[PDB]
Symmetry: T
Subunit: 161 residues, 12 copies
Amino acid sequence: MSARRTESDIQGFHATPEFGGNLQKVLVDLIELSLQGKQAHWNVVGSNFRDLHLQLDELVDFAREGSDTIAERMRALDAVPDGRSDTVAATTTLPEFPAFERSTADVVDLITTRINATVDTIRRVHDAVDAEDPSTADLLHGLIDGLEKQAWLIRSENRKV
Amino acid sequence: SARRTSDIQGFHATPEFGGNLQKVLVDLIELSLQGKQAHWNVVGSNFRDLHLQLDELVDFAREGSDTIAERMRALDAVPDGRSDTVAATTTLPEFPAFERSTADVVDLITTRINATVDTIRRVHDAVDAEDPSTADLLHGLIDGLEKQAWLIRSENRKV
Amino acid sequence: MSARRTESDIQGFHATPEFGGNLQKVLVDLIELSLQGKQAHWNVVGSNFRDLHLQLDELVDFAREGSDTIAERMRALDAVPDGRSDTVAATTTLPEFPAFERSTADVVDLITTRINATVDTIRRVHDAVDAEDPSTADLLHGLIDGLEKQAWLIRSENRKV
Amino acid sequence: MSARRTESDIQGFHATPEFGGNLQKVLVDLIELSLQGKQAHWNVVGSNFRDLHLQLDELVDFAREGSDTIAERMRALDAVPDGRSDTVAATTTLPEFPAFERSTADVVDLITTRINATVDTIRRVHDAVDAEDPSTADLLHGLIDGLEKQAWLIRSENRKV
Amino acid sequence: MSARRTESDIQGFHATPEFGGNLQKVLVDLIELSLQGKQAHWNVVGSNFRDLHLQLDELVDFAREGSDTIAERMRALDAVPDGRSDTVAATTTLPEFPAFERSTADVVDLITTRINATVDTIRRVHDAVDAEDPSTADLLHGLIDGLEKQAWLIRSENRKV
Amino acid sequence: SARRTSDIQGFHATPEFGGNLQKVLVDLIELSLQGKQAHWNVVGSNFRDLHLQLDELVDFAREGSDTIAERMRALDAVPDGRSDTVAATTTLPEFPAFERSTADVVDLITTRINATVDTIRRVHDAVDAEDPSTADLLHGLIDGLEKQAWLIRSENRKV
Amino acid sequence: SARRTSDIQGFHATPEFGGNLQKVLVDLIELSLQGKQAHWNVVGSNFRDLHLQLDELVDFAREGSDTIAERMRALDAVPDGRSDTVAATTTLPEFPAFERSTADVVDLITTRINATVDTIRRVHDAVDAEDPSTADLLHGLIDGLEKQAWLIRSENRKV
Amino acid sequence: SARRTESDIQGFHATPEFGGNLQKVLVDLIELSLQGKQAHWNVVGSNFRDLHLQLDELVDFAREGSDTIAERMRALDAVPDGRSDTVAATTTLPEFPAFERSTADVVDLITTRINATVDTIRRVHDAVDAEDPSTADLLHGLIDGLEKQAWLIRSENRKV
Amino acid sequence: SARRTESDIQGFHATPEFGGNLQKVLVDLIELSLQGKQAHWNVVGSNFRDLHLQLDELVDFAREGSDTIAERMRALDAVPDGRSDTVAATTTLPEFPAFERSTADVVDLITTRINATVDTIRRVHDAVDAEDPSTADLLHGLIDGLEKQAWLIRSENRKV
Amino acid sequence: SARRTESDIQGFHATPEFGGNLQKVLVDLIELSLQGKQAHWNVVGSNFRDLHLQLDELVDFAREGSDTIAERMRALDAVPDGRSDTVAATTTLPEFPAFERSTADVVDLITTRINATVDTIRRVHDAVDAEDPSTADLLHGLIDGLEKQAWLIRSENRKV
Amino acid sequence: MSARRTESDIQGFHATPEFGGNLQKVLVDLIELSLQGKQAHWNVVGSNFRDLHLQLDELVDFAREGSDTIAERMRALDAVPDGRSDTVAATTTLPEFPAFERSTADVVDLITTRINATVDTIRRVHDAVDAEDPSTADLLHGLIDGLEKQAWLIRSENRKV
Amino acid sequence: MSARRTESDIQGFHATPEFGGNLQKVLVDLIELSLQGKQAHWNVVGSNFRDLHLQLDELVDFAREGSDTIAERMRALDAVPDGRSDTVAATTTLPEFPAFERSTADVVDLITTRINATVDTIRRVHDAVDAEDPSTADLLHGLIDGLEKQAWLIRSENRKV
Ligand SMILES: [Cl-]
Ligand SMILES: [Cl-]
Ligand SMILES: [Cl-]
Ligand SMILES: [Cl-]
Ligand SMILES: [Fe+2]
Ligand SMILES: [Fe+2]
Ligand SMILES: [Fe+2]
Ligand SMILES: [Fe+2]
Ligand SMILES: [Fe+2]
Ligand SMILES: [Fe+2]
Ligand SMILES: [Fe+2]
Ligand SMILES: [Fe+2]
Ligand SMILES: [Fe+3]
Ligand SMILES: [Fe+3]
Ligand SMILES: [Fe+3]
Ligand SMILES: [Fe+3]
Ligand SMILES: [Fe+3]
Ligand SMILES: [Fe+3]
Ligand SMILES: [Fe+3]
Ligand SMILES: [Fe+3]
Ligand SMILES: [Fe+3]
Ligand SMILES: [Fe+3]
Ligand SMILES: [Fe+3]
Ligand SMILES: [Fe+3]
Ligand SMILES: [Mg+2]
Ligand SMILES: [Mg+2]
Ligand SMILES: [Mg+2]
Ligand SMILES: [Mg+2]
């Protein structure tokens, strides 16, 4: 006749502090990447300026969408993101982007290593995230895939023969 | 050439697998129906936001039920989304009739989303073991519905 | 100021219990139709599968919009809809949809019959609705027109001439 | 050539002075509603500001399209609309909208009353319009349906249940 | 199961021969109007050519959608349309469109007359249609409203005031 | 400067050229009317595909008739697309009244498309000789209609 | 760090500034209402162009009135766009009732656009002196409306 | 096995005369675009709006056409010249008059200039067709599109 | 302070075996796209139009898939080969027959070829997943999308 | 004849002080975007959804603004710095608090931060306007757009 | 009175075997070009990577649309295309694309010559195609025009001074 | 009671001859820039061809929209533009664009200086324009901003380190 549950209060999945911290690690590197990507996008100069200028904006869009995805996933699982400038600066694992104008070739190298660093954070955190919540790991897979594609589209400028 | 030889069959789901997807399906349809009920009948403070959010929940739940039912079809299982079956087999607590306050609707719908996510989380490991590709569809459902739960329940949060 | 009314409270048109009842009847058959339409959509097999599979989704879209229209018209007029599964199952006039895979020929006949049953409810209810509120009768005309079109587009498959 | 008429001049349906008058009444209340809707849109403050601010614009859009529909229906039938400010102020049936910032709770009650007044004009006029020209009565049904929906979506904010 | 009907065959509403005949009359005049509209569209010359050239296409679009609506309403109700050239020529009530280039002033008067003739057919037929099937009468109201609007937008060109 | 001197006339078509375009025009309008007739009245196996395809044929034929009529206007010819003229001068076999089966509609409409293409192919060389630019418009019509014929007739093909 | 210390207020307009924006607002609303009146009731030679152009004028004037009213709100002023206020305080010459010829509508509407632009030009320097950002909004209004005046009045031009 | 073995295969090169023929088309299309904008701005009088709008449509077609011609030239390794001095010095179009012009006058002036542009395309047609039929198809699009514009514009002044 | 100090950080490199696994997927997706177009053109008979259209949808999914796989390979510094000779020489799909084929025959032929393509993805899945779970997620999308196409197509021939 | 004969004509160069003024605007716009996202994620309580949505609209306007300012700097050969350390070290905005915050608190906090950002633009306005009026027009768009956001947000807490 | 033809069976234009073979020649080179274009698009590396990467996808889109156009034209004229991988490999006239990564400059040269080869096929076949069916030659003109434009947009990267 | 003005004739703002001449100066340089931009767009050859080819079209679009804006502003203020080829050639201040193909690096330098020259015209004219009509100066600000952005996006190709 009926299979209906009877509780008036059914709780949702709550992330462990460890899991929250792991997604926080991903968050700050994604925001930092976005900030560095815009810096590069503004200040890149030299041969093949336009392509890099445009590709860098694609990277920024992806990293911004990613940071919102991770922060919102945290919220869904009762964890609390911190994307404030001071926290991002204090805790990001990305090497800092240099000041002033940079050459196209230099920007290609710099941004590639910074995407690599961002992806490394996600891969380092992956197995612990997957173990607690496979659905979140799928979002991580999307980030890895999208970011490694950006790294290919950007780095290929400097690859010879 | 590496070309194979002329009637290669598709992956077919075990009865148990079909049954697990059936469990997900009825709770998604029930959620969709309950969501529309809430959408129409919610009243009170912050009516508009709740009215609108609930329609988005319904869209997701309907897309989800279609995704699951069609995955069943692809793997040679047979969905049953009929009204009697859904009423008879859904695990979701019954949604009340009549007008309900926004605060009560927030609480009620959060419970019923969580019930739906619970079903998907309950079958996840057994479907993943048999067909990882289907578990990915389940992950999208878990992610999307848990997002909806957060967006809805935050209205009632204290500090 | 010349022709302005001075009432603080000007109340809206309220549906009678009979009117609310009449729209409730339309609502449950529209929802049942949507549920059966999807069942048929998923489970139809055989000759001209795709055309039928697609047409059934178009039927479902129309019935879903129809049920939302009806229910919101109820709300506008201070009536209260009930589209919950138990209610729809217990009160719909539509013949039950059979279980399992069904042939395209079978689905055509089954769905045509279910559409006609839905239209019949709207037609039975029409005059009482029109008498109380002509504006709602127009929404009923939209439903009659749209559903009878669906019936034609579906039934024509099985017509032998 | 067999069933073709041979008249050089075939004139169209012309509204009677009464019909023109009846549509004029609908027109001024629709325009007044749009003006009050915008006033409320700009000046509403307090709890749930944004929802109300947005809904009021949706109301205004519907009332503006409504007034254009009515006025052009008049023109089609050789009647002449008057939507000028002095005329609208001197002949509208709507209670005056108050000046200054108003709370969201106040705006809900005020605007619900103004919508209902507008609908009341259309409802009072309906039968005389329907008797002369059923096609125009259908446009009135669109207005009744659309405005009563607006009233429901707005008033529900203040409902305590 | 409680209120479910148990009939294998539930048939739809079937138009009487009179109803089918009445919609046939509307159909041929709509098609004739589309054909004359295009003729006028191509062959109009003189002052304010472009405005007229464009408006005539808008008229044609509406009449084409109208004829499709009518014919499909016939099909829905088990009636059979005939929109073939010989039938339209032999049975239309519209005065014949003249050959050759025609002035913008001439086209305005000619097309206004043809529109009015088309509307007259719908108006003559309306009550018999409404009596049998109110839902179809609503489609007629759409046509009356849309065509009379077209007539206004076209005739206003020649109005001297 | 290479600037010319103030009333340079446009290319004007011979009466014969206008007449040839008139021939194309009436068969395109007739096809459009016959296509709609078929669209409404077709019934039976694979109704939906045929119903939909026929509407695409009508769209093409209507766009085509407008293209030809306006080319006539551009070259100072005067189209006649009126109902009596079309009925009196079309080369297309009459389409039957009443409901027709999908199989019969496929055969009937294929014949009438082919008749329309035949007209365009019949006048092609004489229009090309006078105005190559107009023959390009004819080529688009031949291509598009012959595509329609293939898409429609394939339904009835044996093996 | 250069971070400030927790209740920094927004720029607030003087009463005079609010009043000047109020002046612009009522003339924009009046223009919108007059434009629709003209749009409906214009008849005669070149009806369609005028009918259509007048609707574009109305769109601009409505967008403009919303821009001004919301700028008032942002700067803590309170708009009054009510029918009585607009009728009582607009500087625009009354638009006549009844059908008017296209030639008369061109002249009438040009005058009333110019009246509206005149108001904005009259308050410009006093608003610019207080808040340059608001004067930019006024510039868009001057530009757009003067464009409308040109597009409308050109119909009546002699040689 | 059917594969050609040459490492570099050359594409079709246009003769310089062919390039010169397309160049004639180009300058007249650019001149027409420039005159069309002049007319679009400066037209006044009865039925102003229709003409103002129709003139912009002409300009859009003419600008798209000149891009099509110049890019066809580049495809075949010809080199277009669309610079102002070249256009002014080599266009065959009668000069457009200065100042405001009535809609009636603009209709006649622009019809003539469209007809002049079309005439250039028609004059080079056979020489272009003989060398490269694909390019002649682009000429056909231009003839068709421009003669349509001529009809749409001149119809305003037709008294029947 | 948490910032890494190395000037160049290396990204994830796929093993050559991983690249080889994705390569198997790629050739079958390309072969499937090519056979799908062959079927789309040459299908005739009852319910022609639905099949003609469904086959193009399959081709779109298969083309998008092969781009996804080839670009994932490039991301991980593998090097795809989608050239005709390689596809023909290394595809595991049964050859599609020449000439016109009936809708019934096309349904069965294409179902088999979709099933063959899916089988390749399923065969390499675990080896791909073990090295790079993110890539396995792309494999899942392909399995899901292709098996849907198989269902949508084969249903035409199902007799119940 | 009116043509200038110099082979290279220099564009307008911004003084370094001008660049510095735009830099102040930039860091506050970026800080505002970052705080806006923080608020957007962490806001809870009555009327959550409206605020959640309005905060994203603010973030979109602020991100577009910072791009506009940074690109205006580049146009005039100034060099922006939008890096996290620089933003944190040089923003004039009060720090946004950690953790979940109520909708009422978020309304007041964000209004203040919008007002701080606007104040920076208003402070540099006259110095920017004196050197380059075109840039001051961009400042006006920002003032107008941000003060609108301030009104739309703070209205939630207004008790009348 | 009537100009209507009387045959119940009117056949369509049927291509000669020679014509079918000529379009088949065009088909395989278009498919081969598409395959090579994607290979280049994936494997291009070096200065100005992105522009070439993107342009190559434009070329692929055009060649794919072209192959479908030619194959469908064949079908319209009762000819039977063969676009299978074995046939394409066995019969294409394009020099094969090399394996592995290639430099931007190398890809520009390689793809230019392969477009040149594809266009050469169409030009070689042109006159015989035109003689039998001028409408098909027009499709060939589109292919020539579109492909030679691609060749210009791609080759210009390597052109100096 | 009433604040309505009483004149039946209210004139619009009329530009001085000087102001008209100033906007004319802006106009011819914008048209010249558009003409040169297309010349460069067609004839640019070499490393990073595609980016420049595309960016040049963006510049052309902006300069075309600008020329229409200025000419229409002139018309609004009763001034009469001259954008004819002879006038543009006789009066533009831009150095002429060279003939034949030019290298990417050369085009970057050439176009940058020509944008610089166009902007210089607008800046030279600015204060006199602003003094008479601040609203027109705002349009000039848009042109300056948009053109200087183009100059940055184009020139950055040639900027080293
Ligand atoms: Cl379809
Ligand atoms: Cl919203
Ligand atoms: Cl228009
Ligand atoms: Cl790009
Ligand atoms: Fe996924
Ligand atoms: Fe997984
Ligand atoms: Fe209706
Ligand atoms: Fe009625
Ligand atoms: Fe040709
Ligand atoms: Fe200013
Ligand atoms: Fe062509
Ligand atoms: Fe501005
Ligand atoms: Fe978000
Ligand atoms: Fe589905
Ligand atoms: Fe709803
Ligand atoms: Fe209107
Ligand atoms: Fe239809
Ligand atoms: Fe047309
Ligand atoms: Fe607003
Ligand atoms: Fe271009
Ligand atoms: Fe790609
Ligand atoms: Fe940017
Ligand atoms: Fe195709
Ligand atoms: Fe313009
Ligand atoms: Mg079918
Ligand atoms: Mg809210
Ligand atoms: Mg006009
Ligand atoms: Mg590049």
